[PDB]
Amino acid sequence: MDEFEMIKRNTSEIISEEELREVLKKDEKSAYIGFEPSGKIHLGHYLQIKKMIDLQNAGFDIIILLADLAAYLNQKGELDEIRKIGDYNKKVFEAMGLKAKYVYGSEFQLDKDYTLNVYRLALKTTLKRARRSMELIAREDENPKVAEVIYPIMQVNTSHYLGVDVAVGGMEQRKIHMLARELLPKKVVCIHNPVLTGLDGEGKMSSSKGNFIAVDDSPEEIRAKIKKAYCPAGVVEGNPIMEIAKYFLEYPLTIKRPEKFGGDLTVNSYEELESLFKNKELHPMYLKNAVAEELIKILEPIRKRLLE
Amino acid sequence: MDEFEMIKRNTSEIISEEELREVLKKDEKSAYIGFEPSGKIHLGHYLQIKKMIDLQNAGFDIIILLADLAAYLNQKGELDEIRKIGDYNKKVFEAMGLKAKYVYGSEFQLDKDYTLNVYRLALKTTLKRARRSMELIAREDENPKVAEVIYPIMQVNTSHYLGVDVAVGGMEQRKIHMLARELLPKKVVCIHNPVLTGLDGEGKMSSSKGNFIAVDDSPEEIRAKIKKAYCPAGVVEGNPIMEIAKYFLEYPLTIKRPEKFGGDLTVNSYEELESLFKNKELHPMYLKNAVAEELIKILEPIRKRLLE
Numbered sequence: 299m300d301e302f303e304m305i306k307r308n309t310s311e312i313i314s315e316e317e318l319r320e321v322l323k324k325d326e327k328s329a330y331i332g333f334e335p336s337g338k339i340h341l342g343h344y345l346q347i348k349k350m351i352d353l354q355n356a357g358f359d360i361i362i363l364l365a366d367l368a369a370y371l372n373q374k375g376e377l378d379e380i381r382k383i384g385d386y387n388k389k390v391f392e393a394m395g396l397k398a399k400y401v402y403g404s405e406f407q408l409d410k411d412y413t414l415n416v417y418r419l420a421l422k423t424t425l426k427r428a429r430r431s432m433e434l435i436a437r438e439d440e441n442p443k444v445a446e447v448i449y450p451i452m453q454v455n456t457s458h459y460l461g462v463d464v465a466v467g468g469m470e471q472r473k474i475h476m477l478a479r480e481l482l483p484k485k486v487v488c489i490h491n492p493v494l495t496g497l498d499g500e501g502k503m504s505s506s507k508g509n510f511i512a513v514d515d516s517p518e519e520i521r522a523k524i525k526k527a528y529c530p531a532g533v534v535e536g537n538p539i540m541e542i543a544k545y546f547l548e549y550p551l552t553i554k555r556p557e558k559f560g561g562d563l564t565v566n567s568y569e570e571l572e573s574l575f576k577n578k579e580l581h582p583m584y585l586k587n588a589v590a591e592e593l594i595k596i597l598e599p600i601r602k603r604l605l606e
Numbered sequence: 607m608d609e610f611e612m613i614k615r616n617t618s619e620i621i622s623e624e625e626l627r628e629v630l631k632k633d634e635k636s637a638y639i640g641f642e643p644s645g646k647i648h649l650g651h652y653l654q655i656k657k658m659i660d661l662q663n664a665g666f667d668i669i670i671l672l673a674d675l676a677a678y679l680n681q682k683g684e685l686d687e688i689r690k691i692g693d694y695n696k697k698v699f700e701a702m703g704l705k706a707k708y709v710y711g712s713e714f715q716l717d718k719d720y721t722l723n724v725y726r727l728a729l730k731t732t733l734k735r736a737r738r739s740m741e742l743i744a745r746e747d748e749n750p751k752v753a754e755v756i757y758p759i760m761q762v763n764t765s766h767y768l769g770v771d772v773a774v775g776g777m778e779q780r781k782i783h784m785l786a787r788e789l790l791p792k793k794v795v796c797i798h799n800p801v802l803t804g805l806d807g808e809g810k811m812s813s814s815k816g817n818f819i820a821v822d823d824s825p826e827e828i829r830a831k832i833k834k835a836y837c838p839a840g841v842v843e844g845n846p847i848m849e850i851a852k853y854f855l856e857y858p859l860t861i862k863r864p865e866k867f868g869g870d871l872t873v874n875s876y877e878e879l880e881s882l883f884k885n886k887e888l889h890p891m892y893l894k895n896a897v898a899e900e901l902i903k904i905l906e907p908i909r910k911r912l913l914e
């Protein structure tokens with residue numbers, strides 16, 4: 299697996315692969331991802347940080363935007379408290395093994411030159427397009443605020459301002475990124491990560507929906523969350539436990555199981571696991587026990603650094 | 607007529623009269639009006655400048671905002687060319703006899719602190735409310751831009767920033783002013799001037815509709831415009847010529863007319879003129895001739911200063 303394939307592994311899409319290939323040739327290249335500060339950092343965040351680590355290993359300088367101003371526009375509270383959560387998020391990201399340059403949006407997104415560019419972009423972006431770009435990001439509001447449409451153009455300008463070669467985000471960010479690629483002078487290569495399913499199988503995993511596993515959850519808590527998670531036999535689509543096996547576990551994977559139920563099985567790839575589960579040769583209970591124990595070991599050093 | 611009544615004369619509404627009364631008691635009070643720079647300065651502009659002059663005579667310090675940034679957000683062109691028109695507008699306003707402090711929006715509306723307040727206001731203003739406030743101001747656009755909703759909150763913040771006691775504008779500005787009075791810590795007294803009717807009777811007078819008399823039009827041009835203007839006998843409502851008699855002429859007004867048609871008539875007030883015209887005792891032709899000649903003399907010193 300070369301660098302391109304390492305970067306591509308477990309991503310939903312890369313816009314565009316040809317452009318990424320041109321970027322990889324350079325000695326100096328940079329990539330960023332931004333996150334509205336979150337009280338709990340979960341597997342969805344970890345999935346993306348893992349991807350930033352892949353880029354870093356491929357020679358990219360990484361910038362992590364603690365998107366405080368965006369969170370502010372998206373009704374997450376006052377800037378002061380939001381920045382505090384941002385500082386906590388930085389510590390968690392560092393505990394994940396990512397060394398990068400962390401910047402707070404408000405450090406530069408209120409500067410006269412930034413603002414003028416935001417207003418120039420506002421002249422080129424239709425209200426309809428801006429609202430559509432925020433469908434999967436905007437905080438639920440029966441009476442949508444003007445702030446909601448300022449948010450996407452502020453995000454489009456970040457890539458321009460940072461001068462990055464690559465922007466990373468979950469698939470929820472794809473419409474904002476399409477806007478950026480259409481409006482900015484320089485097209486940024488966009489790498490989109492899949493959106494994890496919530497533990498109960500209802501909708502996507504989210505900090506606001508309480509359907510996630512946080513990276514610092516205790517082992518006992520992880521086991522309890524996985525035990526009650528949606529995981530119908532033979533069903534892979536929308537199955538959060540299979541998603542965890544695909545995105546976080548390493549193979550070969552040894553699945554412990556009593557001899558009376560088939561004995562231990564060693565799966566050499568997620569594809570093999572997917573095969574077994576689909577044919578109902580692996581019961582949800584044993585898939586769950588293996589995923590919980592392996593996930594606990596994966597997260598252990600992060601929780602340990604955060605509690606130390 | 608005291609100061610309050612002088613300020614109130616020919617206005618559509620004052621929000622609120624009690625508040626204006628409290629303001630008038632102060633030794634130091636200020637008022638502003640903003641205009642998106644216009645290629646031609648017309649009677650609608652003059653009507654408002656006349657009102658600013660009334661306020662100045664009542665002891666107010668006047669600030670005229672050459673609203674370049676707003677015009678930019680409202681698709682009037684590039685800031686550089688817009689500012690140039692703004693400078694021309696200042697010269698016309700000075701030729702009207704107004705001495706005031708002229709400021710360009712872009713001088714302060716892109717500052718970090720201004721912008722943060724704009725975003726704070728964006729969190730409190732619904733998209734629906736912002737669009738409604740722009741119905742009579744926004745440039746026609748089949749695909750409304752995000753810029754359209756940034757415009758009203760930028761305008762709400764101007765009063766806050768300038769610290770004025772009074773904001774003046776045409777009735778088209780009333781929804782933005784209502785928003786300002788609801789959102790700002792200090793309620794600004796809003797004085798609204800009537801919207802003049804276009805010369806052809808179709809819709810309101812506008813720089814973009816070419817249905818106006820510019821203050822520097824030649825006498826010959828004024829006569830031609832008034833000659834072809836909508837002015838049905840006995841009809842006062844939506845009659846631009848009667849509006850001109852009401853808002854710009856001084857009384858007693860002598861209306862020249864051949865003896866065979868009734869001879870000259872001296873009207874001591876606009877109300878008397880309105881009475882005569884309604885009862886069809888004054889023919890459109892003679893109302894028009896008198897209005898054109900008197901308007902020419904009213905505008906003469908302005909055109910002269912602009913051509914000198």
Ligand SMILES: N[C@@H](Cc1ccc(O)c(I)c1)C(=O)O
Pocket residue numbers: 331332333334363365368403435452453454456457471
């Ligand atoms: N939209 C991201 C946060 C984010 C990302 C990048 C960026 O430039 C900005 I401004 C904000 C989220 O949903 O968390």
Ligand SMILES: N[C@@H](Cc1ccc(O)c(I)c1)C(=O)O
Pocket residue numbers: 639640641642671673676711743760761762764765779
């Ligand atoms: N809306 C006015 C222009 C204007 C006025 C005041 C203000 O604070 C701003 I920002 C702009 C117009 O229609 O010309």
